[PDB]
């Protein structure tokens, strides 16, 4: 009954690696001793309940702290000047100077300035006082309590769901699309139309009077009569001021498009109409699959009979239903890939089409949110590929996938890997070559020789969307175009002015720097996909190790025989692709941050001139914008950014410490620990105190994991202070 | 308020120290006979 009760081998392990491996295999429930599928699924269900409880506790904590210690009520009156407060600081290490510097935001105590946009979100959805935030926090706390009770309950004997119920795909998909997506989005549209539009128009609608107050003067009579245009009639005027009745309309569902002029955010009526329409579409979608009545579809039948003629895709999608519904790793990988794509989409769309009031002028929050969601998108994509590899090495059955669409991937994996290698090499060679050419040309005082390629195709797409400065005059940019004529009466009158207005991040102007950095991003994405795809496809075996599936997913090596077999397990292909994930998201965030900093400063010529060469990138972005951060504290004093400076150097330290684990490997440290063991055992007094687990150096995979974690954490903790502190100090 | 002073040390020094002590003792518990 040692600590790794789930692993008898680790329990009998006498060294200190028992603790490490137990901790890191605690959640690998599939490989646990004496584990069954039904128990696995039930334990997963309970852990999901606990996780949801944690999420709602985190949200309730944010709300409570803003309500109690934040200046939400003061910020509501003057959103564009008052700095939002996250929470108070309690630190007995602070000096008087630190307390004075951190006293800010119109409060009498030290505080932290929120950079998450929660103030903007809550103000937009219609929170006006600390009481509303407190009651929301209480509701979320009660929800977390209920979820924890549910997680406890569903592990009970009489309340333990069965494996057939878990594997009921059709009912789950029907409900999680018609209710979880559809009805929830309908509920959000109802919340907007009942509470948010009235609050933006100067009406205090709360639980005590939402029953009495009508969302529309007409009521539901237009809805039941079919005269649904009455709800679009009388939209908000361009002279409207958010939160006040002056210039306010009566429409609840509109398609104006563009942006609200005062807040430079999308119309709440447009957002409500969006959610209503998409809820209708989701509710219709959720009746597809057969559940207990007769109508519907069978996913097994669909997949089985989807096979093209003459065996183009082999046997088609036969057996994919079985593999997907049997293997949880494939489902996890698909979910992670979809969620990573969605996270990239929200990151790309929040800045281009801001939805929350006054967020466009809050430059720190925009950069923080973009960097945050892009990093999480990268993490989710790497996880999706890693779990695909785990599925291949653990849950793939060639007998079931005899000549399947999935098996043909393994059939021509060599071609796939070689072509990924080719495209990666081409992009890298030519992007780096053009960059170095531009560097040398500017270095020799002759910038005229630069190879500057205009992103003609992206500019063409901008023109097709409605941009006019390029002069392409295609589709929506052409006044005569049939597309413009068709859309002229619904959304184009707002969209055209929004896109052509130069004060906005919607379809930013692009140039040779954008061309070059986009091709660098393509290089990085293709190389990350190369590493991950090769890991997934060679996880089962390789010419250097055809029996890799017997060893499994994460093993150290096969020894120095056959020339050396370092980093062969396809867990090491996660490890090696995490570096490229950090690289590509770093390039993306550098690009976003610099192109937005220059535009906020009204100095886009600096980006357009200096972004074409790496010296310009190093000088005008990092070196230039690093001054307010490093000057957070100096010999003469300290500012509110001293915390950010400390963290920049702390992330630097963690990143550098990761290199130790990544470079120096286990034998050196094992011999050193043997010497230390000798010294401890031979010294007097101290030899009375004796360990229980024999100290040993960290395992190979353990130290790869630790070094990668140090690398990643130093990466994020040294870039976040930069992107926040420089943006705060410049305020542009 | 005084809740920060009362709670921050309680939850960041006393509780994590007790948690580390409990975890260490539990992992060092031997098999039952």
């Amino acid at each position: 009954t040692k600590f790794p009760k789930f692993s008898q081998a680790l329990a009998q392990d006498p060294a200190t690696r028992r603790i490490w491996y137990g901790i890191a295999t605690a959640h690998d429930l599939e490989s646990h001793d004496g584990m069954t599928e039904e128990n696995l699924y039930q334990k997963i269900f309970a852990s999901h309940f606990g996780h949801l409880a944690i999420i709602f506790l985190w949200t309730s904590g944010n709300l409570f702290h803003v309500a109690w210690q934040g200046n939400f009520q003061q910020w509501v009156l003057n959103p564009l000047k008052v700095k939002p407060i996250a929470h108070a600081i309690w630190d007995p290490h602070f000096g008087q100077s630190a307390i004075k510097a951190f006293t800010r935001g119109g409060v009498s105590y030290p505080v932290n300035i929120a950079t998450s946009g929660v103030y903007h979100w809550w103000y937009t959805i219609g929170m006006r006082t600390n009481e509303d935030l407190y009651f929301g926090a209480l509701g979320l706390l009660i929800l977390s309590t209920a979820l924890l009770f549910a997680g406890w309950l569903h592990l009970q004997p009489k309340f333990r769901p069965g494996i057939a119920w878990f594997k009921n795909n059709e009912s789950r998909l029907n409900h999680h699309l018609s209710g979880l997506f559809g009805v929830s989005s309908l509920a959000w549209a109802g919340h907007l139309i009942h509470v948010a539009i009235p609050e933006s128009r100067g009406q205090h609608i709360r639980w005590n009077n939402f029953t009495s107050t009508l969302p529309h003067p007409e009521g539901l009579t237009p809805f039941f009569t079919g005269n649904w245009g009455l709800y679009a009639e009388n939209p908000d005027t361009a002279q409207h001021i958010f939160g006040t009745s002056e210039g306010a309309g009566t429409a609840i569902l509109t398609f104006l498009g563009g942006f609200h002029p005062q807040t430079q955010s999308m119309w709440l009526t447009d957002i409500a109409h969006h959610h209503l329409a998409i809820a209708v579409v989701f509710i219709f979608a959720g009746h597809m699959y057969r559940t207990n009545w007769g109508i519907g579809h069978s996913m097994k039948e669909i997949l089985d009979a989807h096979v093209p003629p003459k065996g183009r895709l082999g046997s088609g999608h036969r057996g994919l239903f079985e593999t997907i519904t049997d293997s949880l790793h494939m489902q996890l990988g698909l979910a992670l890939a979809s969620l990573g794509v969605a996270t990239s989409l929200v990151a790309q769309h929040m800045y281009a089409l801001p939805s929350y009031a006054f967020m466009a002028k809050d430059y720190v929050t925009q950069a923080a949110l973009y960097t945050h969601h892009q990093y999480i998108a990268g993490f989710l994509m790497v996880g999706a590929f890693a779990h695909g590899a785990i599925f291949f090495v653990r849950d793939y059955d060639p007998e079931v996938n005899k000549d399947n669409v999935l098996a043909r991937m393994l059939q021509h994996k060599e071609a796939i890997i070689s072509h990924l290698s080719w495209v990666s090499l081409f992009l890298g060679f030519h992007t780096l070559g053009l960059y170095i050419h531009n560097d040398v040309c500017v270095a020799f005082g002759t910038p005229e020789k630069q190879i500057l390629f205009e992103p003609v195709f992206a500019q063409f797409i901008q023109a097709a969307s409605g941009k006019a400065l390029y002069g392409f005059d295609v589709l929506l940019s052409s006044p005569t175009s049939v597309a413009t004529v068709a859309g002229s009466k619904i959304w184009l009158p707002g969209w055209v002015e929004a896109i052509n207005s130069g004060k906005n991040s919607l379809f930013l102007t692009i140039g040779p720097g954008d061309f070059l950095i986009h091709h660098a991003i393509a290089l990085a994405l293709h190389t990350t996909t190369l590493i991950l795809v090769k890991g997934a496809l060679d996880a089962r075996g390789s010419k250097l190790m055809p029996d890799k599936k017997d060893f499994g997913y994460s093993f150290p090596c096969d020894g120095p025989g056959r020339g050396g077999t370092c980093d062969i397990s396809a867990w090491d292909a996660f490890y090696l692709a995490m570096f490229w994930m950090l690289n590509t998201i770093g390039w993306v965030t550098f690009y976003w941050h610099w192109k937005h900093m220059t535009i906020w400063g009204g100095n886009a010529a600096a980006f357009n001139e200096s972004s074409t060469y790496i010296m310009g990138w190093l000088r005008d972005y990092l070196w230039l914008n690093s001054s307010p951060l490093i000057n957070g504290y100096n010999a003469f004093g300290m500012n509110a950014q001293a915390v950010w400076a400390w963290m920049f150097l702390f992330g630097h330290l963690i990143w550098a410490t990761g290199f130790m684990f990544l470079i120096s490997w286990r034998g050196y440290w094992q011999e050193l620990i043997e010497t230390l063991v000798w010294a401890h055992e031979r010294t007097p007094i101290a030899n009375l105190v004796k360990w229980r687990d024999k100290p040993v150096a960290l395992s190979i995979v353990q130290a790869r994991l630790v070094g990668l974690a140090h690398f990643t954490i130093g990466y994020i903790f040294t870039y976040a202070p930069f992107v926040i502190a420089s943006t705060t100090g410049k305020f542009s | 308020s005084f809740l920060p002073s009362i709670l921050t040390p309680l939850v960041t020094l006393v509780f994590p120290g007790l948690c580390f002590a409990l975890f260490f003792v539990l992992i060092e518990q031997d098999e039952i006979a």
Partner: peptide, 30 residues
Amino acid sequence: MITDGQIFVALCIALTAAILAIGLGRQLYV
């Protein structure tokens, strides 16, 4: 302005959540 009583009832609900979390953790361990 959030009141001391409001903070206290929220803390009580948090303690209830703590007890339920401990129970859920025990049931997950077994």
